[PDB]
Design a binder for this molecule. Sequence first.
Ligand code: SF4
Lengths: 148, 98, 148, 109, 109, 109, 109, 232
Amino acid sequence: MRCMPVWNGQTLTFVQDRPSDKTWTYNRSNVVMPDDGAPFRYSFSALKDRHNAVEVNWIDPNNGWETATELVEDTQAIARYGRNVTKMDAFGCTSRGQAHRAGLWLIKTELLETQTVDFSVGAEGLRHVPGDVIEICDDDYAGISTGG
Amino acid sequence: DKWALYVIGQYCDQSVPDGFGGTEPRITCNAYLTTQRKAWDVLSDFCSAMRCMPVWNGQTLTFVQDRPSDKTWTYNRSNVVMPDDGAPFRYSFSALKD
Amino acid sequence: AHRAGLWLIKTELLETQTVDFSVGAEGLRHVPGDVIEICDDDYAGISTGGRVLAVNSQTRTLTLDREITLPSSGTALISLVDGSGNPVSVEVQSVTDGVKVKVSRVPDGVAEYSVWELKLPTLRQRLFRCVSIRENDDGTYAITAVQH
Amino acid sequence: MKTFRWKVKPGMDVASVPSVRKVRFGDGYSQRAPAGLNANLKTYSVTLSVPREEATVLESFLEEHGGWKSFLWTPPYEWRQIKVTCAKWSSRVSMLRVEFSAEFEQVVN
Amino acid sequence: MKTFRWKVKPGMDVASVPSVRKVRFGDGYSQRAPAGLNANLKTYSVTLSVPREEATVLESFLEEHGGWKSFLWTPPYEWRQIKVTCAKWSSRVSMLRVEFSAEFEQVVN
Amino acid sequence: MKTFRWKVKPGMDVASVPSVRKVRFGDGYSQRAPAGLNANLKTYSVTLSVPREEATVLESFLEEHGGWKSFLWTPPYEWRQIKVTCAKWSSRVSMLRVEFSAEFEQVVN
Amino acid sequence: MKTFRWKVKPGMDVASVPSVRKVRFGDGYSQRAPAGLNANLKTYSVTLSVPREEATVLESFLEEHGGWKSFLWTPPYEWRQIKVTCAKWSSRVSMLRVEFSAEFEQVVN
Amino acid sequence: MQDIRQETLNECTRAEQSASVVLWEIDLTEVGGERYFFCNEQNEKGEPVTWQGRQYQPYPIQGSGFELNGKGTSTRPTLTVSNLYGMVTGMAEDMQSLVGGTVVRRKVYARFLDAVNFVNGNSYADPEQEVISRWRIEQCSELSAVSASFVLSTPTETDGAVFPGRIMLANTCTWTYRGDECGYSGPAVADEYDQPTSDITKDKCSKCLSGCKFRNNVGNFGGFLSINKLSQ
Ligand code: SF4
C-alpha cells in the first residue's frame, strides 16, 4: 500500500504518500542557528542510486503458483542517464498489474525525490510526527527574504 | 605516455628461455576479458603482469617499470621535517606470515 | 606463469621495510615510482650529509657543514642537486681542514644550502621506491616508500 | 559612511602578526613563505573620548557597517587611506564622557 | 512588574559584537554579510547601589523574571524603550548599602 | 637591505632552550642527545623607541620581511653578526614616541 | 667543564614534589609507594647577576653543555656536590649587569 | 619525477620562497553548465589574479586530501566553494546535474605570476611554470547557505569508468544519435516520445526499436533485440 507507518509515541497510524493539506512552514526566523550560519543542510541521492528500471517479484497463479518477475522501465530516463536496474518484491502482489504498478511507483520515487534537509528546530518539535509535510524558505536560495 | 609504453613493449617482446628448451617472447597477452571490472583494477592487472606500476602523474598517466633506474633522489636528517619527538623516518616491516 | 610466479616470490623475500618520512615544499617534485636513498644519521652515527655552505667553481672546492674523513682505500662519491634541480653525483679527491673538500668537477650552478651526501664505495646504498605522496595542506607532503 | 572622521586622542596599539608557511627540517635548517598573497594586514586598538549627548552619531556610523562594509580610514601612524572593518567596539559610559575601545582590522579590499 | 525604574551608577559597559555571515578558508579572500535583520543587540554590564530596605524589592523584581520573561527598560545610552533580560545579577552586601552587578541583553522578542 | 641599524632599550630577554632529543618512559632512566648540529638558536624579545617620522621607515623595513626573509643583525648581547627573522613586532604609538615589541628568532638559513 | 663556579647572591627556590604512585580505596583508607627508586630530584629556580663582560663566558659553558651531559655543583642550601642539568637559562640584559633565570634539575647518574 | 620546469624545481628547494598560489577551474561544458575560474586570494591591488592572461575571480574555494598514489586513490579529494549569495545553487537546477564536471587545479609560486598583479612589476613572470591536475566531480557531498563541498577523483578511477566498456541491452541503443556509429544523416523524423516531428531542433532518438524504425535505420541498432528482458 502507498503509506509509511508512524508510531505517534502513543498509537500506530498510517499516512498515505498523497499531496496532503495542512503543510507546516519554516524559515531562517523559525529554525535554530548554529555558530556557522547553516539553518538547513541539503544532501542529494547519488546519481548511480536513482534506478530507472526494476525487476519486480510476484507469484503468478496462471503460470503455476511460482515466482515470476515483471520488468518496469522508464524509457525517457534510460534514454538520457544510461540504465540502472534494481530488484523489488511487491508484498502481497499476485496479479501482474499490481506488480507493474508497484514497480512504476518505486522508479518514480527514486527518480524525483532526490534532496533531504536536516534543519534541527526549537521547542515546536513535539507537534511533529514522521510523514508531516513542511515547506522551507531560504533567502540565499530565493534572492530576497519573504518570511518571518 | 606512448613513449614509456613503447619502451615497455620492446622489453616484453625480448626472447627468453621457454622452459621446454625453446625460446619465447617474454610477456604476451591472450586474455578474453568477459566481465565488467573497474577500469583501474584492470589497468593495474595489465601493469602488474608486465613488471611496472601505473603512475597518474596528475596531468597524464605513465608506466614506471620496476628496474634499476638512475636519477635517485637523496633524503637525510637536514631535508625531511623533524617532529617534536626526534623521529624523522618511521620504518615498519611486513609480517613473517606474509 | 613461472616467471610471473618467481617475480612475486623474490619481491616478498627481498623487499620488507617501508619508511614514512613527511617532507616539505619539494613534495610537488615527486610522483609515485620515484626512487629515493634514505641516508639516516641513526644508521651512521657520523652524519655524512647536510646542506652546502659555499661553492668555489675555479679550483673546484665545496665548503660544507660537519666533517668529512676520506676512506683510506677506494674513492668515495658526493651526491648534489644540479642547476637543473636533478640528482647528479661526482668524485672526491682531497680534503683541506675537514670542511673544504675537493671534487673532480662542480656541476653547473650548484645552489648553496642544497642537500649533499657522501657515499663510501664499500657500503649498502639502502634504496626505496615511492608509493604515495599526500598533501597536508601546510605545504608539507607525507611520503611512503617501500624497500627497492 | 565610506570614511572615518573622528581622531584618536591618546594613540593606538597596532599588532602585525603576519602569516608564514614555515617548515622545520633536521639540523636547525627550515623553509618559510609569506603563505597568503598579502600576509600582514595588521589590527589597530582605536580609543576615542566623546561627549555623552553626541556619542549617538559615532555609534550609528559604526553600527550601520555591522562587521562587514569596510570603510576608508587614515591612521595617525602612516597617513594613507586603508579600508578597515569594526567587529566589537566596546563602549564605557560615565556621568560626563563615553569611551570607545574598538578593533579596526585592515582588509586589502 | 513589566518595567525597570531604579537609576543606575556611572559604571555601565556596552559591548556590541553584531552577528555576521563570515566565510573564508585559510588566510584568503573573505565574504561578509549582515546575517539576519537585528544585527546588533548589545550587552550592558550595569552596576546599582541601594540601601538595605528595598534591596529585597530589587531582588524579587529580578527573580520574578529569572532569566526568561524580558522586561521594558530605557538605558542611559540611547534613551529608547527596549525589551532586555537579566542573566545572573551577582549581588554584594556591605554594612549600610548593597551593590548589584548585572548583565542586560536586549531581545527583539 | 639585509641588516638592522636601530638603537635598543636596556631591557630585552634572550631565551635559549636548546633542541634535545631525549627518550624517557614514565619517570625512570632518561638518555639525552644534542639532536641538531645548531643546538641552541636563541630568541630576542627586543623593545625599540623611535620618533613618529622614522616609525614609517622601521615599519616598512619589517613589512618587506613579513615573517620570512631572514636579515643579518648584531645584538649587543655578544656583538656577533647572526641571521634573524621577525614574527609579530606589536607597536604602540604615543604623542611623540613609538614603542616596538618584537621576537627575533635567529636562523641558519 | 664539570663544576659550576659562579655564586648565587640572592638565593633560589627549591621544590621537591617527588613521584609517588597511590591508590584511593573506599572508606577513607588508601595505599602509597615511592613509584621509582629515585623519586625526588629537587628543581632549583636559580637567579644569577653578572657584569656584561663576564656574561659571554657563562653563556659558552651553559650552551656547550646544552640540555644534556650534567655538571657537578654545590648549592648553598645543603653544601654538597650534586650532578645537575639546565634546559632554559632565559637572559635579562640591563645597562650594567645581566640576569639569568635558569632551571636546574638534579640527576642520579 | 613530476612534469615541472627548471625554475619551479629550483624554487621548491630554496630556504625562503614566494607564496604557493592555487588556481581552480570548474568546467561544466560537457555536463550542460559553464566554465568558472576561481582563486582563494586577490593580488597586492585587491583585483582578480591574472595567470597566462586569465582572470581567476577572488572567491572562497579550497580543497583537502589531494594525493598521488601508485596503487589507487583510496579517500577521494574534497573541494569546497562558499554558497553565500547562492551562486553554487544557481550553477544548476539539480546539484547532481553537475556530476561528471571537470576540475583543473594549478599550483604555482607567486614569483612566476603575471607582471599586472604587482604595483612594482615582475622580472620573473613566466606563464609556463605551474603544476596541473584534472579531477571529475563525483558527488555534491553537501550544500548549506554558507558552503557546498564536492568529492573529486582522477578520470582514470572516477566511477562510470569500467572496462570492457559496452553493456549489452535489449531494446536500447547506445550509439550517440546522428553520431559516427548510429550513422543516420536524414532529415528530422521524431522526438524521444516517438511523436512524428518535422522540426530539426526537437528531433531526438528514443534509442528504442520504435525510434530506430522512425529514423529507418534498424540495421545499425546499438542493441541486441532478443536477449532477455530480465537479467542474471
Ligand atoms: S536507435 Fe537507431 S537512430 Fe537511434 S541512435 Fe540507435 S542507431 Fe541511431
